[PDB]
Structure formats: C-alpha cells, structure tokens
Amino acid sequence: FVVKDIHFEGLQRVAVGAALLSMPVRTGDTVNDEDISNTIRALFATGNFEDVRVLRDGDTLLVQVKERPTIASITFSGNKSVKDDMLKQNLEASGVRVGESLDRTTIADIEKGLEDFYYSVGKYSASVKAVVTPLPRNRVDLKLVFQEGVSAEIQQINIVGNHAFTTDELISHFQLRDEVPWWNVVGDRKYQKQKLAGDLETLRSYYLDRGYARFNIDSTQVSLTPDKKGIYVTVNITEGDQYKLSGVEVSGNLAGHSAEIEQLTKIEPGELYNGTKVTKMEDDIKKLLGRYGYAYPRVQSMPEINDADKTVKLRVNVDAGNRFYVRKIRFEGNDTSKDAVLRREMRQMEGAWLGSDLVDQGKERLNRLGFFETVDTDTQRVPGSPDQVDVVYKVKERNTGSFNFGIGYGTESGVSFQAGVQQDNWLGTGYAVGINGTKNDYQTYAELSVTNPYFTVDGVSLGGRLFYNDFQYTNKSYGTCVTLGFPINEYNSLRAGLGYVHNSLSNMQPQVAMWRYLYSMGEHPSTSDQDNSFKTDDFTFNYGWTYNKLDRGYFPTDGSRVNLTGKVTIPGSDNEYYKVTLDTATYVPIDDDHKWVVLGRTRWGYGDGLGGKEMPFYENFYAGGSSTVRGFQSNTIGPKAVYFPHQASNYDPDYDYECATQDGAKDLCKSDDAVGGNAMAVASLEFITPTPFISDKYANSVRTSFFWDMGTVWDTNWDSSQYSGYPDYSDPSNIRMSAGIALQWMSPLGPLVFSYAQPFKKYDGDKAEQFQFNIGK
Amino acid sequence: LFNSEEDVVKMSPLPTVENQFTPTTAWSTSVGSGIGNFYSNLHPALADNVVYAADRAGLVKALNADDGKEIWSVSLAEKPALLSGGVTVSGGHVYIGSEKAQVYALNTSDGTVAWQTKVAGEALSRPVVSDGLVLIHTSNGQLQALNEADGAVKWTVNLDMPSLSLRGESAPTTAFGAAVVGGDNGRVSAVLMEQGQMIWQQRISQATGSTEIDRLSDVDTTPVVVNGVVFALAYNGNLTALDLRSGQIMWKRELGSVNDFIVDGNRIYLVDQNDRVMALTIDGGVTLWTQSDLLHRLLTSPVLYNGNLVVGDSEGYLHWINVEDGRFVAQQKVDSSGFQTEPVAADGKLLIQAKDGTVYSITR
Amino acid sequence: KVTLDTATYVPIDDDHKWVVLGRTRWGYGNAMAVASLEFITPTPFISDKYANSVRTSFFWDMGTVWNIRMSAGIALQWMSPLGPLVFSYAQPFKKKAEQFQFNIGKTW
Amino acid sequence: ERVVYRPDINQGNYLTANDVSKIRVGMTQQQVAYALGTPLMSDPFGTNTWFYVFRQQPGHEGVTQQTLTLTFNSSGVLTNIDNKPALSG
Amino acid sequence: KEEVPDNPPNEIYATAQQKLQDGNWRQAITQLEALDNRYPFGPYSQQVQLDLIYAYYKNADLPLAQAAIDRFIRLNPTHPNIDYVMYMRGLTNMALDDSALQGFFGVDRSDRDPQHARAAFSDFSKLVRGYPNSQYTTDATKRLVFLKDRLAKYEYSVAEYYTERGAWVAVVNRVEGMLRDYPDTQATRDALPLMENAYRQMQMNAQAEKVAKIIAANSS
Amino acid sequence: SRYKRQVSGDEAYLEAAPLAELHAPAGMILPVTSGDYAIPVTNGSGAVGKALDIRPPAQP
C-alpha cells in the first residue's frame, strides 16, 4: 500500500511540516500498519499524547491524537529547609521544564524525584504530593506540596578498633557532633552526606599525623533508626603500627636545584612520622620550583614501609617539567574600574616567566583592594606553543559608592541636617573621595577627603583632607592637610604631610593650665571674667613612621610593632611648638611552642614651645583607660584643672557652675577634672598563659593574661614657685600603676576584650575603674 | 529553633477500653540507668526463676524472678561499655554483646566473666546459642560463631551491606543444625552450623523505587522456623514463607513488612511500618483481623501471654489485644518514659524494660 | 567598632497586608542596646500597585546606652526612583526631641 | 635615587650559561627553539632575527640584562649569533 | 503587572504594538511577553519575537535581548530577515560595551574591559561578510570602524601602563600586537613611539632605528 | 539600567575618524595582518545613524 497524503488536526504544539519531517514515513511512501504504529511512536517521541485513532478508507491516511491540557506552569508550597532556587533548579534538572508537556506519569516521577532530593539533603521522612489544574488552550498549572518532619539527628559517632586514643577525642576533632553541650546550644546536629567524608578524611589525617602509616578505614557505614529521626554513624579502624621516619631521598629530573632541595628535605634521623609535614615538604618543593619559573612541576612522595624495622623511607620523585612564560595578562568583568587600576596592583609582570605564587598573591592583592565581590584566576596554554600561557582574571565589581542624607526637626530645637557622600574607586580611576556634613542646631561639622592611592606607580599615595568645625568652651576650627605615604619594605612604612589649622577659642573658663599659655602668646585676658577670645593659625609639618612584624592574625605570638608620629610648626605660624610620640609592642615567647608569651608595651610623648612660646593646651597628652593603662577612667591620669575665681560664669550661675562660681569660693578650685600633660610615659609587662578552663579545639579561640601597667603624665614647665601650695605636676616621679587580669576572644568579625585591674598605686583624684571592656584592641 | 519541631506523623489518638484484665505490677526494680534515647536491643532474660538484666552503661544484674531482689551485680566496664545486643542464657552462661565489638560470657551463679572476646565490629544482635556455638550477627554483616566454652571463633560468614543500612539487628535462628539469618541487604540466608558452609539465600524485596528510602530493605527481624517452613519479613519487602531446604518462596504478602512477628496456632502476628497489629494465616498470608488504631505510637515486639497479645508503646502503656479478634482488652498504667525493647515470653512471668531501665513484672 | 542586629517578621492577616515585626540591635564602639516592635498596615489612599512599594508602619522603641530612651512613632517608607526613603514622626515617653525625621540612603 | 619599595620587575625569558652554550651555528629554528624555549621577542619587520633578552630589576635599585640575538637564513638555519653578557650602558 | 483580556490574540497584539509605537517599552514588553506566554506557537510568534527583541533592546534589558536573539537565531537560522537579528546582536553587544561609569557618561571608558566591543565587532563583521546586500551593512560598517579604533585604544592603554611600569618587553609585545591586528588606525600610529622607546631602553638600537624609520615615513 | 545612552541610538560612533593605513619605508615590511579587517563592501542605499529604520520589518 502507498499513501498519497497525510491528514492531521489540531497541530497545537507542532506544525504539519515539522510533524511530517519528524516521523519516519512521510507522504508518498509505501506504508502499512507497522509504519503507522511507528508514526505513533514518533508521536510518543514528541511527547504530547498517546491515545490515537487511525483510518485507511482510501489512498490517504487519517490519524488523530486525543487532546488534553498538558502544558504546565509550576508553583510550590511552603518549603522551609530547601530554598526556592534550589527547589526550582532541581525541578528543572529533573525534566519538568516550565511551559512544557506534563503528564500524570510525569507527576508521579517528579514526586519521587523531589523525595529523593529531600532525603539526599537529609530531610528523611519527607513526603511529596503534586497536583495540576486546567488552563484554557492546552495549559495547566502544577501545584506540588511537601510535608517533612524533624531533620535527622546523628545519635552517635562510634569509632571502633581505635587504640591508644579515646573515641571522645577523635570525635572532638570531627565537625559532626553527637552531643551539643547546653553551654553551646547554638551548635549543630544535622547529618550531611558529604561532611561525613570530610570528617573521615580528618580522622585519617589525625592518625597519619600521629604516624600510623598503615592506618586504614577498612569499613565505614551509616544506619537509620526505624523512627527516622536517629542516624547512627560507625567507623571501623585498623592503625597497624607506629612508625619512625627514615632519611628522605629525592630523585628525578631536578633542574640543577639539587642543593636547595636537599637542604629543604633534611630531617633528623629517627623522627616520628607525620603526614602533614610530608605534605608540607612536597608543597615546599613545588613552591620552590615555582619561584624559579617552572609553573607546572610534578612531585610525588611514595613511601616505603619497613614493617619489621618500624621505619619508612620517604622517596620523593621530582621533575621540573618546562619553564612557562606569561605572554598575556587579561582581565574580564572589569566593566567599570580603569584597567590600570587592576594591573598596578598585581606582581606578575607580562612578558616574563610565570611565578605561580606571584599570580596568586596578585589575586590576593585584588581581593584586598576590596572593589570586587569575587576574583578568580584562570591560566590556559596558547595553541601551538609549549612554553607560554595567557593568565586571565575574572572579577565581579562590587558597588562601592555610598550616599546618605538626613533631616531632623523638633520641639525646643530647630532643623537638623546630615549628609554623607563617599566612593572609593572614584569613576573607576581608583581615587577615593568623601564629603561629609552635619549642621546641628548648636554645632556645624563638615569635611572633605580625597586620596589617590598611587600618586606614582611605585605606590606613593597622596591624600588630602579639608575640615571645618564650630560650636556654640566655644570652639571653631578649620584647616587642610595633604600627606604622602609610601612603603619602604614589606614591614616598614613612612609618611609625611604638611597641614594648616585655624582655630578660634572663646569664652573659656580661666584656669592656670592655660592662662600661662595665653600669656606666652601675649594674650592677657582678665582672670575675673569669661569675655576672653583668642585666635591663631597653625602651619604644620606632620610626619610619621611605622613598623609591623607580627606574623599573626587575631593574637600575635612573636615579633614587634613600632609607630612614630610628630609635628613641627613651620615658621610664621601664630603659635610654634613640636611634639613626638611612640607606640611600641613586643611579643617574646618564653616557650618555643609559643604557648607562654611575655608581651611588653609602651607609649611615649613629649611636646614643648619653640622661640619661648608654649605648646597649645589642646595638643596636650592624656593617659588612662584600656588603651593606655587599665584600672583608671579614660584621660583621668593627667594634671588636674586649677580654676581662677570668675564671675559671669557661663553667662549665668544657674546654681551649678561648681567651685569658683559667681557665688563660689575666693580661691583656686584645684579640681578633680584632668587636663593633659605636655609629656607622657607608659609601660606594660603582660604575661599570657592559658588555664585549664580550655579545650584544645578552642584554646586558640580564647587568650588570657595578667599584667603590670605603669603610667605617668606631667606638666614639664608647671611653675611650682607660684603655686607651691598645690601638688607639683612638674614632677615625673608621681608614677602610678595597676595590676590585673584580662581575657580576650575573637569572633570572626572582631576581637573582644575583658579586663580587671586594681590601681594599687595612685594619687589624689585619679578616677579608678576596676572593670573595663572594649572591642578590637 | 526556627524548625519549630513541627509534627508530621499525626500519631493516632489513644484507643482505650475498660481494664477487664486489671494489669498490675507484681514487682518492679531498677537495673541502672536506661538505654534512654539510644535505639538498642537490650532486653531482660530468664532462667530457672533467676532473671538477668543489663544496662547500656555496662551494669549487669541478676534478679530473682519472684522477689525481684538482686543476687549479684557487676559493672563490666573500665575504671561506658555501650552495652547492647541484649542478654541470652544457656546453661550457666549469660551472653551479652556490646557496641564496641566485645562479647561477654558471665556465670549465672555470680556473674564473674568466664570468657571475653572481640568480634568484627559492634555486636548489635542478640547472641543466639545452640549446641556448643554462640552465633552473633554484627553491624558489618558478619556472622561469627563463638565456641560456647571458649569464645574463640569457629567460623565466619560475610553478608553484603547497603550504602545506608536501617539496623543490622537481624538476629539469626537455628534449625536442624542450620542457622537461618536476615541481613541488611534484604536476603535471608542459611549456613551449616558445624562449619559455616553457605546452603542457600533468597532476595525478598523490590528495589529501584528510590535511590535510598524505597530500597531500604533491611531484614532486621528474626526469622522463625516451624514444621520446616521458614518465615521472613522485611522492612519494605514482603512477608514470605520459604522451605527450610529449597529457599523457594511459597507465597508473598505486602500486608505487613517490618517487625518482630510471632507464630502460634498456625496464626502469625505481626507489626507493620505504621504500627498496626494484625493476625495472618500460615496458609497464605491474609488478614484474619487487623487493629490499625495505634499507628505511629511506636510499638514493641508483641508477646503472646495468657491468651492475649501484649505490646508496649512509645509513652508507657501496655496495650493488651485479644488473641482471636482485634479488640483491646486493657491498658496498663503509664510506665517510666515508655518502652523501646522487647517484652520476654517467660513462662508465667512477663518482664519489660522501660527506656529508663526500670524492669517491670506484669501480672493479672 | 562592631554592630550586630536581628529582625523577625510574622503576618497577622493571611493576605499579609497586616503584619508585625520585631527588631533588636547591639552596638559597641560606649555601647548601645536597642529593641523595637513594629506594626504594619495597608496604606491610606492608593492601590495595590503602589502598595507593592509604599509602606506605612507604627512602632515602639526601647533603647539604652552605657541612658534609657523610649519612644513610639508612625513611619512611612518608599522605594523612590532615586533610592530607598524613610519618613518618621515620634513622640517620646522618656527624657528637645526628635519629633520628625527624614532619611535617604543608597549605595550608588 | 628613590627609596620606595618596588616589586621585582623581571622581563623576557630565562637565560643561563648552561642554556646559551647549547646553541651553535647551523641549528634549525625548531632545535634552538627547543634548546632555549620559544623566543619571547622576534624581529617583526620582515626578517628572522630572534631576541632572547633576559632582564631583571629586582629590589629597590640596580638592573641587569643579558641580550642574546639569533639570526637565520630562510628555511630557518641559524647563521649568526651575538651574545651581550651585560647592559653596556 | 496586569494583563488585558486575551481571547482574540489579534487585539492583544494590536494593543501591544500600539504601546510599542507610542514608545512605552515597559508596557509593550510585558504585553508581548503575555502574548508569547498565551499563544507561544501561534502565527504571531515570529513577529512577536522580533518586536520583543526590539523592546528588550530599547528597554535596555540587554542580557534578555541577548538571550532572545540567540534563541531566535537557533530556532530559525534560515529566517528571511535574520540579517536584522544579526544586526541586533551587534547593537546589543556594543550597547553592553557603552555602559555608564557609575551612572555618568562621557568619561573616556575606552580602557575598560573590551570583551563586549570585541564580540560586537565579531558579530557586525559576521553580518557584513554574510549579507552584503542588506541595508544594515553600511551602518554595521561604521560600527566596525568605530569598534576597531576603540579596541586599539585599549591595547594602547595597556602599552602605556607597561611603559610607565617599565616592562619594556610587554610594551614591545603589545605594540607588535597592535601592528599586526590593528595596523590601519590611530592609537597604533600613536603607539609606535612607545615601541621605539621600549627598544631604545633595552639597548636594541637597530630595532629602535627601524621603528623610527616607520614613524618618520608615516609621520602625519 | 546603565546603558540608557547607547540604546538611544547616540550616533556618536559616526564621528570616529576613518582608518588610515601605514606605508612601509624602504627596506622594511610591516607585520603580516590578521583577522580584524573591516570589509570594504558598502552601499549608498544603506542609511546610517538615526536615519536607519531600525524598527523590525513589516512582515517577517
């Protein structure tokens, strides 16, 4: 039989031509019932529907397929542990495409697939139910709902066959927890399929680090209680035996670096075996060859085990391969940042041999720049060349710019304003700008900051700033500065910068600690009154130096830090002075495990007049508080205010202008209120030693110490001849000091500190504060 | 927590009846702490009116079956033992397993350790004793037969293990010198006890309905042999009856799948995935009566006693069910934190251990 | 300095047009603790198309600094073409005062 | 005369006495490319000359360069060699 | 958003097209998506897709215009007006290059990531070499003439940075790259002094004199 | 969306200077050219800039 034409109806999903070309037998072909069934199989393949009827009443064939709504939209019920994106991506991967054919069989299948997904993510006992509803013109909407009980809780981890080590210690090293203490209820108990593998590798690492080179996990398995809350994990072990490490030997195609490899691969004979130090040895080998331009060396340790001698001979096989050269560096996703803003940061040159650590520390420098959410390198051999590669950096540019604006309005006070525009990475060129303002009702504050981090490509930054403040003692100041700051080693950094500062001082209380300063200026305000007003204009040469060698994160173990800053007034300033400062820190470990540490600290400072003028009192030094010496209120340690009797105090007595008031005493107040000194000395000896309230798994997370803090602040040119009846603040020997304890903790975003100290030596009016707390330092 | 501890099992409200049988505690004693939250097979045992009982901490105690007073106590632990597997008795020896792969044999007279050996991994199964062998099933699917006088292994057989087990309790049984045993792979097997030769084995469940849950198929029930027919029952699989020698399936039932079936009067009594009690005939499993009223009030192994089926639930009630129609007969007092382990089919006595370790003697 | 804060939301009516909010903030740098509860309503005079972005709220605030402060207030929020905007009115129960506030804040 | 901390600017391809002494007249271009590695510079303007420049400027100051240059007849036969061992400033 | 009554697809099409004629792309886009969702395989599907790629382009939904264009060229690679879709792939990739710098235009952004300009050049040249009769060919040619210069300015910016860093072999390699890829443009003629400098700093005086000869003979 | 400018049809590209090929001095050759060549085929009929009826064809 031969068919001359084919008839269809509906053709909702597919046109006549597409259907005809899809089927195996087409118009004009010799066909029979079997070929018609094959066309029905093609109709199955397109996956619309299956029920069909056929008729052969002449030279043409009539075929039709029953039409029902199949094209499905998807909507979900309340999913709690598995998020929407996870759910929908899993659904799509399963095969239920949005706006695509669907069927009861498909619904059942996707039900079981979703169940398999839930149980895979460990939501055992879950149930999946899916339903559909009709829509006009062959469409439907898929509604599927889930019920899911308590997540599976690992009842125990039961290591078996371990010896010389207890189960609780090994499971202490697991990230899984069979119990969470009521001290740490924020902990976790949820089972995870892949985390178990990570913990089994942690157990293997532990035994290999203790030296059991024959260690094998000869079976590991999981079981599940009939009520499916409880999961049981059990793990068989055999260690075999403990082994010593014999002399390493290096073989293979060494590129003449044999001396620098042998001296690296030394070990003392009879050393106890350890897996991490072997891995570190192999990594240092391939790092060493990497530094000299072999981007892709092969290294493989292949230990030989003497079960009789209890010794392992660690063979290391090395071949350097061939040198690699970077012909191109590329950046991608850099839609905004000027390309030089990326290239300037990185250390790998183009047209040079590939240092595999230089590319990675380039990526680190790009992260530490901060403009990018993510950075990831790739490296691809160019076609037709054995020796040279492109390196390409993908990035996501973070949105760095910020803008905040605020208005306030009130009763008993007027309008208030704030504004704050800032953007590091300015117009992509890598400048940082900021402009900030605050018109209060009784204050005005504004400042402008711009900093070019590469004024020259070597990394000399040039900063500038402008500021203005005024208040309604009454104070107004405004000024500018520019600073050049440029590293001199990885550790050691230097910076310098001119500055200018106007300030106007008015309506201040008359007191000995500043009236002599005004006298040195030739400003002679009456001590009976508060009409005083003084104006001046500093021109300044600032400088500073810095040193960091701490080689640690949150808690330093060893090394030192120093910071130095100073000022000199440039000639032609309306006042003239200098000051200097040091901060230092010095950590000395008293055991070579760095578990006991002696920490010294100091601060220093001095400042004085030039040309017979005197240093402005607002530049004075203050000491006390956790930043300086613990157990004292902040700034309390200096010499105290000695006020003159003054009428018209604060424009009206108001009954609270204590001491020397309009209705106050005839004589000088000698307050408890501390002015600063013009000179300072501070020291600490701090001893850092953990105590049995610890676990080794958090003994790095908490640090405890006790210390002896010493401090003194004095007023080097206090005239003891006129005020001989009052304590001589010219004398440095009034050293005051405390001792105490401190506790420090390091949650991921910042250190946190507690301290207790007794100011066991102190003098009149020093405000003690036994208990002190601060973040970050 | 954010998870709100939501409830999805919706356990059936408590069915209740007048206490016709007026169950009462003959005596009650504490044998230590309980098994508590750890699912495990510890249950009491009896010989010649001396009871023996055990604690997951390690404590083993012997009690008089009528007085409930201690005869002896041993701590059986280092200066916990994670004691498990559950007590068995033959002659003068008390055999006990551990989740740390030890097996202990204690003297009935005083409890002194007569021998102790290590088996391959945790011995979650109850030791099964026969004609000079102590046969123990481990969590590694190993069957190890220990010399009754000596504790040394005579032979071992390996049974395959799924990537995730349910529970390798799967205690064996002995018949005509062959041991018949379950296994986490869902195949009942038989081995020749003098020497461990494989005789036959048979798969009794479907697979591939899921990557995991629907192919959880553990035969953790004890099989039972009567008149030469083996009965076996598998978590998602069928109840099946088999010949002791052919290993052919006579018939299959889906009617129930999971737990601790028993047989008497040619009727099989069973507990399902969801805790419905039912009775079945040997002559092809069909429902004689069913008691689908207890679903998810996690039941225990049913014990036939005084013409009733006794079963304890997750919260402390001994449900008594009539042996010949599916109707409740009594409901004992709420006992200490519920039950999670078998009652023992002692003669005249009954004992059950609550999850807190209290043993209870139940009488009418 | 460090600041950490938590917010929880739970609707009262099943269309979620009526919903209630609790917020707590802790800050260190002197230190501050703040606790707040807010009720949220459909808006007075515009359709759901605008309600998708315009919001109105009534709130209780309690705060302490180491001072104690307590206030109750009505607030409006809008996501403008420029950026996200807050307007607020307050009548404090504890002690000049912050009787009106207006606040715009965006990253570019 | 500047003190600011520069990174180690290194340029070209690596040369040593052991490497360059492999090259001898009459080698085909492929064999000398194998002996030293691919030339990181070559004369673009219509001739075969190759430039093995090895240049280093590590640390704060001081620079070193070795210039090896090779030139080839057509079909790539090395006909002349020049090797400047230091920057003839 | 809300949708109009839909039972006559011609009327929802006519109102979508009216909104597109008006320039209310935010309405036309949503109503054409509604028509595509309700009648995806209807006769209007093709012209609806061409209107929808136009609305995505003018609405600046460029990654959706890209997805729809790739899907269209996949679905009908032989469509008789596929030249327009090729042209729209050029325009959408070039418009992805021409981004604002943090919302402000007119900064010389020629040395930001060129990959979208490179793709736009590839797709315009794939148009002009394939469909030389099409009316879009002359505009595509002027896009190409702009894009090549905009790429050479990137290579020049990198050669200038390596000149400042003093990586003279990178400077020489990149300017030789410009001289082989981008021979016939400004920025290349501006880069030749960088190559002559780099050769002179490396004491490769013969090459420096060759480059100075090219500069002289080509000096404007 | 940041692209608002170019999607307006800015025709700022039409200002871009024409291509201006180098010529080799005596005794030299310029490096061999590569794939970024703009084909010279152009048509006067083809409109440019805002004048081009970018809107989709009347009957696809």
UniProtKB/Swiss-Prot annotation, chain B:
One of its GO terms (molecular function) is identical protein binding. It holds the Pfam family PQQ_2. One of its GO terms (cellular component) is membrane. Keywords: Cell outer membrane, Lipoprotein, Membrane, Palmitate, Signal. It comes from the Bacteria. It is a lipid-anchor. It is found in: Cell outer membrane. One of its GO terms (biological process) is protein insertion into membrane. PANTHER family: CELL SURFACE PROTEIN, OUTER MEMBRANE PROTEIN ASSEMBLY FACTOR BAMB. Part of the Bam complex, which is composed of the outer membrane protein BamA, and four lipoproteins BamB, BamC, BamD and BamE. Monomer. Interacts directly with BamA. The Bam complex has the shape of a hat, with the BamA beta-barrel crown in the outer membrane and the periplasmic brim formed by the BamA POTRA domains and the 4 lipoproteins. Belongs to the BamB family. Part of the outer membrane protein assembly complex (Bam), which is involved in assembly and insertion of beta-barrel proteins into the outer membrane. Nonessential member of the complex, which may orient the flexible periplasmic domain of BamA for interaction with other Bam components, chaperones and nascent outer membrane proteins. Efficient substrate folding and insertion into the outer membrane requires all 5 subunits. This is Outer membrane protein assembly factor BamB. It comes from Escherichia coli (strain K12). The gene is bamB.
From Swiss-Prot, chain D:
It is a lipid-anchor. It comes from Escherichia coli (strain K12). Disruption phenotype: Mutants show minor defects in the assembly of outer membrane proteins. This is Outer membrane protein assembly factor BamE. The lineage of its organism: Bacteria, Pseudomonadati, Pseudomonadota, Gammaproteobacteria, Enterobacterales. Part of the outer membrane protein assembly complex (Bam), which is involved in assembly and insertion of beta-barrel proteins into the outer membrane. Nonessential member of the complex that stabilizes the interaction between the essential proteins BamA and BamD. May modulate the conformation of BamA, likely through interactions with BamD. Efficient substrate folding and insertion into the outer membrane requires all 5 subunits. Keywords: Cell outer membrane, Lipoprotein, Membrane, Palmitate, Signal. Part of the Bam complex, which is composed of the outer membrane protein BamA, and four lipoproteins BamB, BamC, BamD and BamE. Forms a subcomplex with BamC and BamD. Monomer in the periplasm, but is able to adopt a dimeric conformation in the cytoplasm. The Bam complex has the shape of a hat, with the BamA beta-barrel crown in the outer membrane and the periplasmic brim formed by the BamA POTRA domains and the 4 lipoproteins. The intact Bam complex can have 2 BamE subunits. The keyword Manganese does not apply. Belongs to the BamE family.
From Swiss-Prot, chain E:
Part of the Bam complex, which is composed of the outer membrane protein BamA, and four lipoproteins BamB, BamC, BamD and BamE. Forms a subcomplex with BamC and BamE. Interacts directly with BamA. The Bam complex has the shape of a hat, with the BamA beta-barrel crown in the outer membrane and the periplasmic brim formed by the BamA POTRA domains and the 4 lipoproteins. Belongs to the BamD family. GO terms for cellular component: Bam protein complex; cell outer membrane; membrane. This is Outer membrane protein assembly factor BamD. Its main location: membrane. Disruption phenotype: Depletion decreases the density of outer membrane proteins, but does not significantly affect transport of lipopolysaccharides to the outer membrane. PROSITE patterns: PROKAR_LIPOPROTEIN (PS51257). It comes from the Bacteria. HAMAP family: OM_assembly_BamD. The N-terminal may interact with various proteins as a chaperone to assist in the folding and insertion of proteins into the outer membrane. The C-terminal region may serve as the link between BamA, BamC and BamE. It is a lipid-anchor. It is found in: Cell outer membrane. Keywords: Cell outer membrane, Lipoprotein, Membrane, Palmitate, Signal. The gene is bamD. One of its GO terms (biological process) is Gram-negative-bacterium-type cell outer membrane assembly. NCBIfam families: OM_YfiO, PRK10866.1.
Curated annotation (Swiss-Prot), chain F:
It is found in: Cell outer membrane. It comes from the Bacteria. Belongs to the BamC family. Part of the Bam complex, which is composed of the outer membrane protein BamA, and four lipoproteins BamB, BamC, BamD and BamE. Forms a subcomplex with BamD and BamE. The Bam complex has the shape of a hat, with the BamA beta-barrel crown in the outer membrane and the periplasmic brim formed by the BamA POTRA domains and the 4 lipoproteins. Contains two well-defined domains connected by a flexible linker. The C-terminal domain may serve as an important protein-binding surface for interaction with other Bam components or substrates. In addition, contains a long unstructured N-terminal region, which is required to stabilize the BamCD complex. Only the N-terminus of this protein is observed in the Bam complex in X-ray or EM structures, most of the protein must be highly mobile. Part of the outer membrane protein assembly complex (Bam), which is involved in assembly and insertion of beta-barrel proteins into the outer membrane. Nonessential member of the complex that stabilizes the interaction between the essential proteins BamA and BamD. Efficient substrate folding and insertion into the outer membrane requires all 5 subunits. This is Outer membrane protein assembly factor BamC.
